Amino acid sequence: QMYLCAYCEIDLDLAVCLGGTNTGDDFELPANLSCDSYKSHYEDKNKINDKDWTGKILLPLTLPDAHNFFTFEKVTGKLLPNESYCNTISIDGKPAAETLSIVTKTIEVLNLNCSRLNNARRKLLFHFNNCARERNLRKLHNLLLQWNQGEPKFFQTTRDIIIRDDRICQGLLNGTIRY
């Protein structure tokens, strides 16, 4: 994460982005705000005092190299919690019926479903569709080879969810498809 922030995986020029607000120009709309800015707005609005935020916020890197907590509503681009893999896991030691609430609060506190972020990660679906237009299994294999390479790049969580929820990509990764 040398040039990448934890909450939303955008490319920066714990590093966190500007959150749609340059420096600290105040009187900003609390709907374009994400990451740290909307977190501070939430803190001010709901009068929360404990600012540790460790235990109710799960970020992609600290998780055991897993991203199955998150779905991907492709109609809007929202990252949404998954009933499966959240009702079957516990984090830091808790009942298994609270990981869902941890994920939901993390989405709500950080506000990762901003229209800006949704319309941004919506374009990765377009780019992945354009490769699967000529129906050439070599270019799609190449797309997966570049998207599942080291040094995680811009939006490297949806870049993995998209490959997850596919039958050609998963089959080609497994071995049942040979190009």
């Binding site: 020029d13 749609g20 800006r116 941004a120 374009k123 990765l124 780019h127 190449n142 570049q146």
Partner: protein
């Protein structure tokens, strides 16, 4: 054919009969009795007749050489689009003259009108003609307004035959039944809300005289471009005091309630005279409202009053029929309101035609392409396909021709240059990186376009790296 067209429950059919018994149709048997019968039936059951403008033709009225524009007959909205000075209000003014001549028949305010003034003739020519046509339940009633310059009188002559017959029809209908609906000839301009106020309203001529509320005075001050708020106040004072037909006030109130989101409980103030409205449990006066709210207030009040006066003893006064002309229907409105002003009008004032002029695309991605006319270089051009549910940028670039991104700006030329660098062999050049950083620092690292450009850059990195 003659036996087939004989109808007992239709006047549209029983007007061709009047034209047959006579001459000019087939040279058929003339008489003075069957003509009387089928002229009596011509105006006796005119329920559901929508008076509409069929087509127009211009000769040299202001800046035009020739223009033949046909208006819609199914959709009740027409929008005119053009640049500044592309003759949009010229068509409105020609139709206004036609409506002034249509008036004075059923208004009975003499038989005057509005001819073409010398300053309205096209610069450097000797004749002009505003040929206007109409339609009332099928039949077409024409008009020609002629204006010459001496020595050239053999080019155009006024006719006024169609309105001379149509006013005869309506006058006969009224003479038969006093409780008959009448069409609206409303006309509104950019000087609409120039009178909305209650200052010195007690000594004004509006509240000074015994105004007669009937079905022929509703056309007074209609073809001028101003909505008389003071006469509305006079009407409201009578409807709120004589109560001590309650639907007359209720129906009028429950359309201004629809157009104004959060206004309720209009009440007279018998203190220094003013009108009191409640904006979210806060009592407010007319002077304390905003310009757009007052504009919609005056417009809707004017239509409601002029249409409840025209349809006495009805159950749904605000249906009627009429030809209402509105110039700059997007005047002093927020784009949230310039997205529902038209459908709201057509839900409230259904059976009324609206030939409106607009300067905004928000009011244009709500109307079908076939009901939008674009004026350019003195000629008509129809709108492109797919405008009713289109993104505002597409409408802007295809009907209001303008670049969706400022042609003269430091961040549009830079964007286009950055795209040119990206979609070339120098995508990784230092200049491309510098311009990309410059655009990201301003539009944000997460803009929709820059993500696509970065994706293409990554793809080309990979393609120049697996073959190298």
């Amino acid at each position: 054919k003659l036996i087939k067209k004989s109808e007992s429950g239709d006047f549209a059919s029983s007007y061709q009969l009047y034209k047959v018994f006579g001459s000019k149709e087939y040279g058929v048997e003339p008489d003075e009795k069957m003509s009387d019968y089928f002229k009596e039936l011509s105006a006796k059951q005119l329920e559901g007749g929508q008076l509409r403008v069929a087509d127009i033709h211009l000769e040299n009225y202001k800046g035009f050489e020739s223009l033949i524009m046909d208006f819609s007959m199914k959709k009740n909205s027409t929008i005119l689009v053009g640049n500044n000075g592309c003759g949009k209000s010229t068509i409105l003014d020609a139709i206004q003259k036609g409506l002034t001549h249509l008036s004075s028949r059923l208004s009975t305010r003499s038989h005057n009108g509005d001819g073409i003034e010398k300053h309205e003739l096209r610069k450097g020519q000797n004749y002009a003609s505003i040929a206007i046509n109409y339609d009332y339940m099928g039949i077409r009633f024409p008009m020609i307004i002629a204006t010459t310059e001496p020595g050239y009188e053999d080019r155009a002559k006024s006719n006024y035959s169609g309105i001379n017959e149509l006013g005869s029809i309506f006058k006969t209908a009224h003479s038969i039944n006093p409780n008959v609906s009448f069409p609206l000839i409303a006309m509104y301009t950019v000087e609409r809300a120039n009178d909305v106020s209650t200052r010195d309203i007690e000594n004004s001529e509006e509240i000074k005289e015994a105004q007669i509320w009937d079905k022929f005075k509703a056309y007074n001050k209609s073809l001028t471009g101003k909505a008389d708020f003071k006469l509305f106040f006079r009407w409201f004072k009578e409807l709120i005091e004589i109560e001590n037909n309650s639907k007359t006030l209720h129906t009028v109130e429950d359309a201004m309630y629809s157009f104004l989101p959060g206004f309720s409980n209009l009440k007279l103030q018998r203190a220094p005279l003013d009108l009191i409205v409640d904006k979210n449990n806060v009592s407010l006066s007319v002077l304390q409202l905003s310009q757009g709210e007052k504009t919609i207030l005056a417009l809707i009040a004017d239509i409601a009053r002029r249409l409840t006066l025209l349809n006495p003893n009805s159950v749904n006064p605000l249906d009627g029929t009429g030809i209402v002309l509105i110039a700059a229907i997007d005047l002093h409105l927020h784009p949230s309101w310039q997205q529902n002003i038209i459908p709201r009008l057509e839900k409230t004032f259904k059976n009324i035609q609206f030939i409106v002029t607009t300067h905004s695309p928000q009011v244009c991605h709500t109307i079908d392409s076939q009901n939008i006319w674009l004026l350019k270089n003195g000629q008509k051009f129809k709108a492109p396909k797919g405008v009713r549910g289109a993104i505002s940028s597409w409408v802007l670039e295809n009907l209001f021709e303008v670049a969706q991104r400022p042609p003269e700006d430091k961040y549009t030329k830079l964007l286009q240059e950055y795209k040119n660098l990206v979609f070339s062999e120098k995508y990784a050049s230092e200049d491309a990186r510098k311009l990309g950083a410059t655009l990201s620092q301003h539009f944000g690292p997460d803009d929709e376009t820059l993500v696509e450009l970065k994706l293409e850059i990554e793809k080309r990195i990979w393609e120049d790296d697996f073959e190298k």
